[PDB]
Motif scaffolding. Structure first.
Motif, PDB file in Angstrom:
ATOM      1  N   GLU A  44       0.829  -1.187   0.000  1.00 50.92           N
ATOM      2  CA  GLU A  44       0.000   0.000   0.000  1.00 50.92           C
ATOM      3  C   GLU A  44       0.871   1.247   0.000  1.00 50.92           C
ATOM      4  O   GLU A  44       1.841   1.322   0.759  1.00 50.92           O
ATOM      5  CB  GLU A  44      -0.943   0.016   1.204  1.00 50.92           C
ATOM      6  CG  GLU A  44      -2.036  -1.031   1.095  1.00 50.92           C
ATOM      7  CD  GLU A  44      -2.997  -1.011   2.260  1.00 50.92           C
ATOM      8  OE1 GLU A  44      -2.727  -0.297   3.247  1.00 50.92           O
ATOM      9  OE2 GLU A  44      -4.033  -1.703   2.181  1.00 50.92           O
ATOM     10  N   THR A  47       1.593   7.618   0.037  1.00 50.05           N
ATOM     11  CA  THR A  47       1.360   8.904  -0.605  1.00 50.05           C
ATOM     12  C   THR A  47       0.271   9.642   0.156  1.00 50.05           C
ATOM     13  O   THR A  47      -0.896   9.239   0.116  1.00 50.05           O
ATOM     14  CB  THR A  47       0.934   8.727  -2.055  1.00 50.05           C
ATOM     15  OG1 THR A  47      -0.423   8.275  -2.090  1.00 50.05           O
ATOM     16  CG2 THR A  47       1.773   7.665  -2.699  1.00 50.05           C
ATOM     17  N   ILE A  48       0.637  10.714   0.828  1.00 49.17           N
ATOM     18  CA  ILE A  48      -0.369  11.565   1.442  1.00 49.17           C
ATOM     19  C   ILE A  48      -1.030  12.397   0.353  1.00 49.17           C
ATOM     20  O   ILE A  48      -0.372  12.859  -0.583  1.00 49.17           O
ATOM     21  CB  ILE A  48       0.259  12.422   2.558  1.00 49.17           C
ATOM     22  CG1 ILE A  48       1.500  13.178   2.084  1.00 49.17           C
ATOM     23  CG2 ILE A  48       0.647  11.553   3.722  1.00 49.17           C
ATOM     24  CD1 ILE A  48       1.265  14.617   1.689  1.00 49.17           C
ATOM     25  N   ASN A  49      -2.346  12.549   0.440  1.00 48.91           N
ATOM     26  CA  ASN A  49      -3.062  13.380  -0.522  1.00 48.91           C
ATOM     27  C   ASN A  49      -2.830  14.831  -0.121  1.00 48.91           C
ATOM     28  O   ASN A  49      -3.493  15.346   0.778  1.00 48.91           O
ATOM     29  CB  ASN A  49      -4.541  13.025  -0.547  1.00 48.91           C
ATOM     30  CG  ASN A  49      -5.265  13.639  -1.722  1.00 48.91           C
ATOM     31  OD1 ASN A  49      -4.665  14.311  -2.559  1.00 48.91           O
ATOM     32  ND2 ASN A  49      -6.568  13.425  -1.783  1.00 48.91           N
ATOM     33  N   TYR A  50      -1.910  15.495  -0.835  1.00 44.45           N
ATOM     34  CA  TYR A  50      -1.239  16.690  -0.315  1.00 44.45           C
ATOM     35  C   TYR A  50      -2.127  17.884   0.016  1.00 44.45           C
ATOM     36  O   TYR A  50      -1.989  18.409   1.133  1.00 44.45           O
ATOM     37  CB  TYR A  50      -0.116  17.134  -1.256  1.00 44.45           C
ATOM     38  CG  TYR A  50       0.422  18.487  -0.854  1.00 44.45           C
ATOM     39  CD1 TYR A  50       1.196  18.621   0.285  1.00 44.45           C
ATOM     40  CD2 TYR A  50       0.139  19.637  -1.599  1.00 44.45           C
ATOM     41  CE1 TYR A  50       1.677  19.842   0.668  1.00 44.45           C
ATOM     42  CE2 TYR A  50       0.622  20.861  -1.218  1.00 44.45           C
ATOM     43  CZ  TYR A  50       1.391  20.957  -0.086  1.00 44.45           C
ATOM     44  OH  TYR A  50       1.875  22.181   0.288  1.00 44.45           O
ATOM     45  N   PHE A  52      -5.105  18.240   0.854  1.00 44.64           N
ATOM     46  CA  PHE A  52      -5.906  17.969   2.036  1.00 44.64           C
ATOM     47  C   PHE A  52      -5.024  17.497   3.183  1.00 44.64           C
ATOM     48  O   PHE A  52      -4.880  18.195   4.188  1.00 44.64           O
ATOM     49  CB  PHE A  52      -6.982  16.924   1.737  1.00 44.64           C
ATOM     50  CG  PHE A  52      -8.047  17.386   0.782  1.00 44.64           C
ATOM     51  CD1 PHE A  52      -8.160  18.714   0.396  1.00 44.64           C
ATOM     52  CD2 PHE A  52      -8.965  16.479   0.299  1.00 44.64           C
ATOM     53  CE1 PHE A  52      -9.137  19.111  -0.478  1.00 44.64           C
ATOM     54  CE2 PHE A  52      -9.957  16.874  -0.560  1.00 44.64           C
ATOM     55  CZ  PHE A  52     -10.036  18.189  -0.955  1.00 44.64           C
ATOM     56  N   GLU A  53      -4.387  16.345   3.026  1.00 45.40           N
ATOM     57  CA  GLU A  53      -3.498  15.820   4.052  1.00 45.40           C
ATOM     58  C   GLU A  53      -2.166  16.534   3.931  1.00 45.40           C
ATOM     59  O   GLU A  53      -1.396  16.261   3.007  1.00 45.40           O
ATOM     60  CB  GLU A  53      -3.307  14.316   3.886  1.00 45.40           C
ATOM     61  CG  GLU A  53      -4.545  13.480   4.090  1.00 45.40           C
ATOM     62  CD  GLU A  53      -4.286  12.013   3.814  1.00 45.40           C
ATOM     63  OE1 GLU A  53      -3.181  11.690   3.330  1.00 45.40           O
ATOM     64  OE2 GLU A  53      -5.180  11.182   4.080  1.00 45.40           O
ATOM     65  N   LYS A  54      -1.879  17.439   4.850  1.00 42.36           N
ATOM     66  CA  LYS A  54      -0.585  18.093   4.832  1.00 42.36           C
ATOM     67  C   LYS A  54       0.410  17.277   5.640  1.00 42.36           C
ATOM     68  O   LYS A  54       0.050  16.618   6.616  1.00 42.36           O
ATOM     69  CB  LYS A  54      -0.689  19.519   5.365  1.00 42.36           C
ATOM     70  CG  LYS A  54      -1.522  20.407   4.459  1.00 42.36           C
ATOM     71  CD  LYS A  54      -1.597  21.834   4.953  1.00 42.36           C
ATOM     72  CE  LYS A  54      -2.457  22.680   4.032  1.00 42.36           C
ATOM     73  NZ  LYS A  54      -2.535  24.096   4.482  1.00 42.36           N
TER      74      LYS A  54
END
Lengths: 59, 68
Positions: A44, A47-50, A52-54
């Motif tokens: 898995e 990758t943080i969803n940038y 939104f997810e900082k």
């Protein structure tokens, strides 16, 4: 205190030399490399969803 | 009291071995199972081709009897 490398000779016993010959003429460790890459395929992703997810930081 | 960052009584060790399993078949076994499946395919191939030639000869006989 040292550990120098590349100390193996190609063994002239028939088992080791026919295993290296079957390795050469059967393309074995290339398939082992594909197996390692598939092992990282089914993980898995980290990758943080940038926007939104900082990302994490420090105080 | 003081509040530094010490290790708590000693921590566990971490390995430093080139851990390699080198698994898989040998030369003889992989070689023999490949050639065995090869010969299996050859035998089935031979059977299907000769029965196919029987049917194609029947098609030839059809065009022979049809012609005049």
């Amino acid at each position: 205190t040292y550990k120098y490398v590349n100390l193996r000779e190609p063994s002239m016993d028939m088992k080791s030399v026919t295993d290296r010959a079957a390795q050469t003429l059967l393309w074995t460790e290339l398939i082992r490399g594909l197996g390692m890459t598939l092992s990282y395929l089914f993980r898995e992703p980290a990758t943080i969803n940038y926007p939104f997810e900082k990302g994490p930081l420090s105080p | 009291v003081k509040q530094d960052m010490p290790p708590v009584g000693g921590y566990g060790p971490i390995d430093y071995k080139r851990n390699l399993p080198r698994r898989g078949l040998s030369g003889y076994s992989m070689f023999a199972v490949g050639i065995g499946a090869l010969l299996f395919g050859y035998w089935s191939m031979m059977r299907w081709n000769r029965e196919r030639r029987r049917l194609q000869i029947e098609d030839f006989e059809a065009r022979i009897a049809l012609m005049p």
